[PDB]
Each structure stands twice: as C-alpha cells, then as structure tokens.
C-alpha cells in the first residue's frame with residue numbers, strides 16, 4: 010500500500026498494476042522463471058486489494074484492462090486470465106474506456122476468449138453509450154459538459 | 166416480446182407484451198395503470214384504426230419492427246373518440 | 262408497479278418501477294419523503310431535461326432491463342448525433 | 358455390468374494415453390533408446406499406477422511412430438529415436 | 441413444484457474442449473509439451489495444441505477431423 014501510494018511508473022508509463030498484467034514484463038533468467046510468471050492473478054488481486062489505481066493509464070493510454078485482453082495465451086492459463094479480468098472489472102476498471110488511439114479493449118481484445126470474458130463482465134450503462142456516441146460523431150464537447158464529465162468523454 | 170410506446174397527447178407509457186396476443190389485455194392493463202373507464206381505448210397505428218380482436222403482431226409491428234431500443238408509437242386517444250393529438254417530442258438544439 | 266416521469270416541457274412518461282430503479286438518481290427520488298404511495302403514479306418532476314432525452318432514457322431503461330444479461334446478440338443503442346451531448350448529461354444526472 | 362465394463366474400458370483407454378505420454382517423455386529425455394531399454398523404462402516409470410502389459414506398450418509404440426512423435430531407427434527394430 | 445434439487449456440470453464457456461491429437465484437454469499441456477503451450481485455432485473451428493498442429497501440418501495439409509486444408513488464424 011505504501012509503494013502504491015507513490016504510484017511508480019516505468020519509462021512507458023506502466024504502473025505497478027500494468028506490469029503485473031502485462032505478459033511482456035521481463036523475468037530474470039535465474040530461478041525467478043520457475044515462480045514469477047506474468048500475468049499473475051494473485052499479484053493483481055493483492056494489488057487491487059491494496060488500493061492500486063485500476064483506471065490508471067500508461068503513456069500510450071492503455072489501462073490495466075487494455076493489456077490483459079491483448080494476452081496471446083487465452084486457453085493455456087485460462088484460470089489465470091479469467092481470475093484477473095474479473096478482478097479488474099470488480100475493482101472498478103472501465104470496460105469501455107479508450108487509449109490515445111481510441112481503441113476499446115473489446116476492439117483490442119484480438120482474441121475470441123478474452124472478448125467473450127470481457128463481454129460477459131461488461132456492465133452496460135447509458136453514460137458509456139452516450140459518451141461513445143459523442144466521441145464517434147466528434148461533437149464539440151468543450152465547455153458544454155460538466156468538468157467531471159470532460160474526462161469521461163476523454164477516455165470513453 | 167414486443168415493446169410498445171403508447172402515446173396520448175403528452176402522456177407516454179412503455180409496455181412489454183408478446184407477438185401473438187390480443188389487444189384485450191393491453192387495453193385492460195392501460196386501463197389499470199391509467200385509471201380511466203375501459204371504453205375509451207382506441208389504439209391508433211400510424212393514424213389509423215385497428216381491430217380489437219386481431220393480434221398485435223399482424224397489426225403493423227413485430228419483434229423486428231418494435232424493439233426495446235426503439236419502440237413503435239401507438240396513439241391512445243380517449244373518447245370525450247377524440248382526434249389524434251400526439252404531441253411530438255421537443256426537437257434537439259441545432260448542433261454546430 | 263408503474264412510476265411516472267415528467268419532463269420540463271410538460272411531457273409525461275410512465276414506465277415500470279423495476280425498469281426505472283436501474284438509475285440511482287430516480288431510485289433516490291422515489292425513496293425519501295414524498296413517495297406518494299398510490300402504487301400507480303409515483304410521479305417525479307424533472308425540471309431540467311427536455312422531453313426527447315427523457316424518452317431516450319426510458320427507452321434505455323427498457324433496453325437494459327431486457328438485455329441485462331443475454332447472449333452475444335446485443336443490438337446497439339440507436340443514439341442520434343443530435344440527441345448526444347444532451348443525453349450524456351442526462352445519464353450523468355440519472356447515474357445510469 | 359453393462360456400464361461397469363465401460364469404466365473397465367475407460368481405464369483401458371486412459372491406460373493408452375498415459376502409456377503414449379510415458380514413451381514421449383522417456384525417449385526425448387535420452388533422444389534414443391533400444392526397444393527392450395524403452396519397455397523396461399516405461400514399466401518402471403508407471404509403477405505408482407497400472408501394471409502395463411507388454412502387448413499394450415508395443416501397441417502404443419507402433420501408434421506413436423505412425424503419429425510421427427518418435428521414429429524407428431535404420432539399424433533394426435531394437436533401436437528407437439526421437440523426431 | 442414443492443422442492444427440487446439438481447446437479448450442474450459447469451464447464452468453461454470455450455466452444456472447443458479437447459485437442460483431438462493427443463486426446464488431452466486444452467487447459468493443460470500437450471504430450472510433447474508436458475516433458476520439460478500455446479493454442480492454435482483453425483478456420484474450420486478446429487483448435488489444437490501448437491506442437492500437435494505443427495506435427496500434423498508436418499505430416500499433411502489436412503485437418504485432423506475433416507478433409508480440409510489447414511490454415512492459421
């Protein structure tokens with residue numbers, strides 16, 4: 010918890026939750042390969058219980074949910090992949106937010122299994138649909154909406 | 166699972182029913198939730214009368230036509246039958 | 262069982278109570294003082310939102326109740342560009 | 358007994374997959390083995406389970422080479438190599 | 441009805457269940473891979489282990505269940 014409250018970030022904006030989610034996180038060639046395998050659902054669940062910023066994005070804009078859907082091994086460790094998508098959504102990660110390239114994690118799922126899991130765990134809301142329609146039609150939303158909703162249009 | 170947006174001047178009622186059913190129970194439920202005599206229900210689809218015994222699936226809307234995302238309007242002018250005076254929704258402002 | 266939603270521009274909308282309790286703000290409005298326990302009207306007066314956005318949020322209520330959990334066949338919500346940026350603030354107010 | 362023999366044959370089926378998985382693991386740890394050397398090693402590695410009959414292992418051997426998981430060498434039938 | 445108790449055989453919602461090469465499930469490892477992987481799907485809704493698919497395409501360009509030319513995803 011003390012380390013999370015500093016919000017540590019790598020070169021490419023990766024928070025401590027993103028690296029525990031990303032499969033590209035390096036593992037040392039020594040005995041750490043036998044234990045520390047990423048993504049790990051226990052690490053993500055412990056970090057979310059300790060108060061990790063689940064909606065935090067990197068420099069590219071990908072959230073914690075944007076990297077877990079990009080996992081290229083959906084069935085080999087499906088027990089890990091299922092137990093981490095549920096944890097992120099239950100923590101409060103948006104299932105509709107977009108990165109700087111304006112890509113939904115459904116669009117960046119690149120996998121039938123991850124898309125199925127996410128769509129099962131999506132909680133549909135009118136605010137997300139309206140914000141997606143606003144962003145799709147490129148409507149001028151500056152100074153016409155509450156300031157607490159400008160960010161909402163920003164990532165949706 | 167047909168979905169209807171019953172209109173009467175300004176009042177609007179959203180109702181769920183089945184494809185193959187009569188409008189008898191539809192008139193009865195709108196009577197129950199409107200607190201009006203049950204003899205003034207004259208349902209109108211696209212400003213025309215319809216039979217009170219014919220199924221509503223053949224009346225002009227179905228599952229592919231009437232949806233929860235976009236229900237079909239059904240005027241419900243009451244006998245004082247009054248003329249159809251369905252007030253349209255307010256137009257959105259002219260976007261730049 | 263049925264609640265009433267009144268827009269700023271005189272329009273009245275009636276939807277099922279379970280359909281309208283999916284938004285937190287309407288649930289808060291129905292709770293507290295002035296429940297008006299007639300079990301048929303429970304009328305809430307929205308003094309700000311226009312009629313078209315209220316119609317769209319009622320359609321959203323029905324749409325979400327129908328598709329709260331289903332198969333992959335989830336049809337998209339038909340949001341017009343003109344009704345957006347006014348339904349977004351409406352959903353913010355309603356906490357939909 | 359109509360369904361008891363099904364569980365007496367399901368164990369026979371799972372015997373074949375466990376025998377085939379045993380030969381792949383044993384041979385590729387050495388990359389080459391004789392016929393008698395592999396047969397004794399298959400039995401010794403499956404003592405905490407069924408006692409495998411000699412006819413079943415050689416039946417799993419001839420299936421395995423046909424599946425191109427292992428290959429019989431060019432010397433004789435008493436020389437097996439991985440592939 | 442008064443009272444009813446049943447049993448449910450819950451399984452994961454993946455459409456494909458087992459690799460029909462090694463007669464093994466897809467959740468665990470293949471026979472080539474156990475001794476010490478990724479899953480390869482097909483255009484004809486045929487999903488197997490990566491090592492099993494590699495060996496099968498090394499044998500012939502025919503899908504393991506039907507006479508169809510194997511393709512990647």
Ligand SMILES: [Zn+2]
Pocket residue numbers: 469470472473474477478489490491
């Ligand atoms: Zn493998």
Ligand SMILES: [Zn+2]
Pocket residue numbers: 459460461462463464470471488489492
């Ligand atoms: Zn396999």
Ligand SMILES: [Zn+2]
Pocket residue numbers: 482483484485486503504505506508510
């Ligand atoms: Zn195939």
